[PDB]
Symmetry: C2
Subunit: 559 residues, 2 copies
Amino acid sequence: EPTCNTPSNRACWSDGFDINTDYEVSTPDTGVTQSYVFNLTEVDNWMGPDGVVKEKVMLINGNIMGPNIVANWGDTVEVTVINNLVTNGTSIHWHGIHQKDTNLHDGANGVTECPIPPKGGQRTYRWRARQYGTSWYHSHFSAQYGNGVVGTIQINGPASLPYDIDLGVFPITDYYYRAADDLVHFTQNNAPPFSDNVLINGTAVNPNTGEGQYANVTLTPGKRHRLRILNTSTENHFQVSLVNHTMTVIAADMVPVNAMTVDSLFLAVGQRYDVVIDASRAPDNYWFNVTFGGQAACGGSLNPHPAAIFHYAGAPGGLPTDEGTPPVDHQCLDTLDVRPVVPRSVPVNSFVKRPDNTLPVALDLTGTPLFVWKVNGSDINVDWGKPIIDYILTGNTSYPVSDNIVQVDAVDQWTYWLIENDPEGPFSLPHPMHLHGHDFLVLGRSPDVPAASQQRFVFDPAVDLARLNGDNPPRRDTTMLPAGGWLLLAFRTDNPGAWLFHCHIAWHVSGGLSVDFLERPADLRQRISQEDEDDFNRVCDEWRAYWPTNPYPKIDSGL
Amino acid sequence: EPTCNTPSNRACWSDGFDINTDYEVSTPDTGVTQSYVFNLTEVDNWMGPDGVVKEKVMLINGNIMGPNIVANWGDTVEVTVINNLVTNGTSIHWHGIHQKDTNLHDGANGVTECPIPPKGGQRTYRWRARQYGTSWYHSHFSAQYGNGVVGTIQINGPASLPYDIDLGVFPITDYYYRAADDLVHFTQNNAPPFSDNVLINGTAVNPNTGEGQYANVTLTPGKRHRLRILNTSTENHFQVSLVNHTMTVIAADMVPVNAMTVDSLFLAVGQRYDVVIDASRAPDNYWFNVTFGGQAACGGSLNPHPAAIFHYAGAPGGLPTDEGTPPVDHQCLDTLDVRPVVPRSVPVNSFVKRPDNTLPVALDLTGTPLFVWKVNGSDINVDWGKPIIDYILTGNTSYPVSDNIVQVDAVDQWTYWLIENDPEGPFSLPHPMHLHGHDFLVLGRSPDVPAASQQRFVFDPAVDLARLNGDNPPRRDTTMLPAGGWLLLAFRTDNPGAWLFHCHIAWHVSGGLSVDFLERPADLRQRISQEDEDDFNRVCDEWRAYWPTNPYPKIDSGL
Ligand SMILES: *[C@@H]1O[C@H](CO)[C@@H](O[C@@H]2O[C@H](CO)[C@@H](O)[C@H](O)[C@H]2NC(C)=O)[C@H](O)[C@H]1NC(C)=O
Ligand SMILES: *[C@@H]1O[C@H](CO)[C@@H](O[C@@H]2O[C@H](CO)[C@@H](O)[C@H](O)[C@H]2NC(C)=O)[C@H](O)[C@H]1NC(C)=O
Ligand SMILES: *[C@@H]1O[C@H](CO)[C@@H](O[C@@H]2O[C@H](CO)[C@@H](O)[C@H](O)[C@H]2NC(C)=O)[C@H](O)[C@H]1NC(C)=O
Ligand SMILES: *[C@@H]1O[C@H](CO)[C@@H](O[C@@H]2O[C@H](CO)[C@@H](O)[C@H](O)[C@H]2NC(C)=O)[C@H](O)[C@H]1NC(C)=O
Ligand SMILES: *[C@@H]1O[C@H](CO)[C@@H](O)[C@H](O)[C@H]1NC(C)=O
Ligand SMILES: *[C@@H]1O[C@H](CO)[C@@H](O)[C@H](O)[C@H]1NC(C)=O
Ligand SMILES: *[C@@H]1O[C@H](CO)[C@@H](O)[C@H](O)[C@H]1NC(C)=O
Ligand SMILES: *[C@@H]1O[C@H](CO)[C@@H](O)[C@H](O)[C@H]1NC(C)=O
Ligand SMILES: *[C@@H]1O[C@H](CO)[C@@H](O)[C@H](O)[C@H]1NC(C)=O
Ligand SMILES: *[C@@H]1O[C@H](CO)[C@@H](O)[C@H](O)[C@H]1NC(C)=O
Ligand SMILES: *[C@@H]1O[C@H](CO)[C@@H](O)[C@H](O)[C@H]1NC(C)=O
Ligand SMILES: COc1cc(O)cc(OC)c1O
Ligand SMILES: COc1cc(O)cc(OC)c1O
Ligand SMILES: [Cl-]
Ligand SMILES: [Cl-]
Ligand SMILES: [Cu+2]
Ligand SMILES: [Cu+2]
Ligand SMILES: [Cu+2]
Ligand SMILES: [Cu+2]
Ligand SMILES: [Cu+2]
Ligand SMILES: [Cu+2]
Ligand SMILES: [Cu+2]
Ligand SMILES: [Cu+2]
């Protein structure tokens, strides 16, 4: 609960708690729990928001996304997930949510937990709100969030700007007619398709039948407005802009940033950015355009102009008439100009490339299926019925090779990670790289160049040390790995558990694009409570019980 | 020679020849032969126009391009080609030059001749210029033209518009510091690289050092000028545009067309557009920009802004100052609005797909190397030491698979060809499809989408007969095959010959992307002259004899 957060002062929140408070080491005690249930059901022949009937959808409480969770900073959020799907396991991952000492509530099935069984299994997740900002939650069961298992989190708190109205979440998703497993088998041997449409907060028009409707957001004239924009796509990466208006980014993912005003923004998959918009132009209807760039290397759509309408309150109705101007091609690259409100510094001199700090990504085309993704020479392939948490608990330390375990014992230390992008391969792609348990610092990346340019860059200290940023760099949970090049990441081992680090393109992690940071194993066995350990075996026993009866194979990594 | 061709009336040419004559059935008798020699040699460590030193080049008379051939409508062109390369054969193909019953001069090694042996090998081509306009010549000995065995052709004749100055040729080319064979070798297992630079009339600035010079054309203020723009690249497809000026296309490849005024034009490898430009703007310097569109699906260059300077005679020196606006994205597609001055009509109310009219193009990844191109189940591979003409002349009619033979017996009839671009494959790229011996009709294509939009079209009678056009359609020798799509074209069988039909990207034809039209083979043998026969046999003799002493392997189609 806030006591001094007001339109005129958003930086303050409670006594001793504000925009300057280091939220990773200090949280509010509110005593308040927001409770939620997620009841999942498979719908066949469902008539989607643009007119088109889909073969099958996977639906939370029978809507297009689940419940929009809202808690305040300091609260707890508890969610009982009941899986009334026909065949599918599930497991809800809370994206952006650090899980500080609650690794078991992470929802990375095969890693932190077995999936809840179909036809009625259930499980309560509970975690603390030690961050405030905009994130979201979705299935990590192979690519099922692409079927509909997904929604948003708003955990309210201080902002790095005053604003009058919080317009609330504005999520954006690529939207395909073919269901998520059809799409996985399809991308095992074939280039990912253009999305059939892009939904904006649930809705979009069919550029071919005219059915459906635009998102319609009403600005109070002369008021400033927080809008919380997200990319919930399985694959599209997006570029966004508001015709005749600037957007001032006040946070990226769930990390508040100094005010940074811009004409457009790239959001990858899993990215979010909260922004203020000042309704100070002429009363009217303005397009909100979704565009794309980086020469389709990070997706596009058969809808050639996905859009929403921003309508000033008092102005006539109907559609915008200024088409606007195209934004700068952002080239499948996020902006590294953002600067956290709450600093971090680490040194960006000393750097040595060695096998224990380096994650080489490589598309193997010489197997079956054609498109297989490998980190440090192995495609991930978790065991759904034998998560890493059952190894931890039963004391087994011989993790399979499939598991892609990257072991980190150092306690509370900064660790630097070189992620390499198939500099050697036949070709290289944009990958949206995202970390569970943690926000990383984006120390640096290989030169910014058009995405489809085939140029290949190997980290060199002679030239690349000079390019690193150790002084309050971007901190967030999702960033771009450059086409044919390299990302230099750093994270503080401040959270024992098994924490995935993967590309967030549903087809890519599906095909092998993951690691598993085993972060501080022995500490982790101790901080896992009896209620979690016990709930872990129940769900695991039932699943293992469920699994052999299931009429369909596992046909991908599990993630 | 012309007797009435003046700036005010370009349509006339001489007594009985004019812009309306059907140059495919009627030619001037001038009795004039224009003679040329091409003395080809290997130079190692050669400093290119942009200040950068290449490992190896193959040049014609010690320059970056060979003689600029020039002649009147009617004459003969007779070029002795003396091969003073170390290791490689050569065979100079005259591209856009139909070779009316001069098939053994077409310069397709493996098809119409053996390679001219290295170390003083020698052969003289003669063909009649029964077509005026702009085209070009280059090697066909695998990818050798990527090294410098290239140049251009201007057969003077009437035009579709009056103009005061012929600015003469302006060839545009991708420019790669690596040597052709290495590039071949590379693209066998890797996406093709963006060019290191683009040369315009033979020159470019290096955009990393500034060394070199811009191409620089003077305009006589107030005058109408004709520029004969060509795309001579191994790969890049280009978009061009003149800042603050229009261009009127008065010809396409060697087909004049009715005048068509545009803002910018797309040229695929091989293509040519003569245009008219009126220096009617303010006296100044303007950038002529080469840009790319179609989402790098057919091109890119690491020079961000290849440009030349169009300088108005009388205005001052220095660089153009108005940077201008990017042309439209032409999506890797040639324009089909173009109308030949001498029209052809065929029927388009009536088509049926069959094996015998259907070219299925296929990228095959299942083998060695990674990237093999297949048309109708087979990657072409010709035999430099037994050319299909040694078959026609030995009455041997048992052609290997490899040669990708297409027997068209019909005498002087329209034949229809459905070309399919891997609608089933893992992905599909545009291809510049080039027919030897003929100009084709472009009846049509799959409809026009973004080049990387992943869309797959199969020709459909129901839907696609209303998209065809038998009423004077673009006529030309190169046109685009759409990514995942199709193309329908036609030619008359008025030329007994063996005629390659292949994608002009050096890499893809090196890879297998060809067929061979064995056009009216019975007709062919009666028509080879004693001197053509014996000369073909001589060269074949010295090639077959040279070949066992060649130190490198053939690694590619041959072509
Ligand atoms: C989870 O959900 C769907 C249930 O429909 C499964 O997807 C189907 O897989 C079958 C068997 O491989 C295919 O033949 C169907 O085409 C798929 N249909 C759709 C609509 O995707 C998937 O197999 C399931 N995975 C598991 C292990 O339960
Ligand atoms: C914003 O979205 C709008 C509406 O979807 C886009 O407007 C379309 O513009 C195209 C492009 O010329 C027109 O042919 C359509 O008729 C427009 N739709 C409407 C309803 O006006 C708009 O172009 C987007 N603007 C930008 C920069 O992408
Ligand atoms: C054509 O000429 C070039 C002349 O060098 C040959 O190219 C070389 O090929 C060898 C053998 O694979 C390589 O080691 C060299 O690196 C190549 N040099 C360059 C710069 O490309 C090529 O083999 C010749 N081809 C034939 C068929 O004789
Ligand atoms: C056309 O070509 C010029 C040739 O390089 C490009 O213009 C710029 O080059 C100047 C040299 O004057 C540089 O300062 C700029 O960085 C380049 N222009 C920019 C930033 O766009 C030019 O852009 C090309 N323009 C067109 C018409 O698309
Ligand atoms: C899930 O929703 C269904 C409606 O389809 C309802 O019948 C059922 O009781 C719900 N499950 C639970 C335990 O909430
Ligand atoms: C959007 O909603 C507002 C407020 O209720 C209304 O003024 C307007 O009619 C709507 N316009 C659109 C985008 O269709
Ligand atoms: C990559 O695997 C190698 C070789 O097996 C191992 O020595 C190395 O430390 C691994 N690196 C990472 C980053 O896990
Ligand atoms: C070819 O050019 C060379 C120099 O490169 C010259 O020596 C030679 O005489 C010329 N050869 C012929 C046959 O024209
Ligand atoms: C082409 O370059 C040549 C030099 O070989 C020059 O004489 C000519 O005028 C150039 N063409 C144009 C259009 O500038
Ligand atoms: C281009 O040539 C013209 C005509 O000779 C001259 O006026 C102009 O200064 C030249 N410009 C450059 C940059 O070389
Ligand atoms: C394609 O191949 C088949 C042989 O399977 C043949 O029947 C057909 O004539 C071929 N099509 C063309 C145009 O070559
Ligand atoms: C733009 O995205 C892709 C293009 C491709 O060509 C292949 C892929 O996966 C194997 C891709 O993801
Ligand atoms: C843009 O052109 C290509 C892209 C690719 O990714 C592979 C290729 O194989 C030849 C290509 O030609
Ligand atoms: Cl996370
Ligand atoms: Cl030709
Ligand atoms: Cu996520
Ligand atoms: Cu996550
Ligand atoms: Cu990826
Ligand atoms: Cu994840
Ligand atoms: Cu050619
Ligand atoms: Cu040709
Ligand atoms: Cu091709
Ligand atoms: Cu050819």
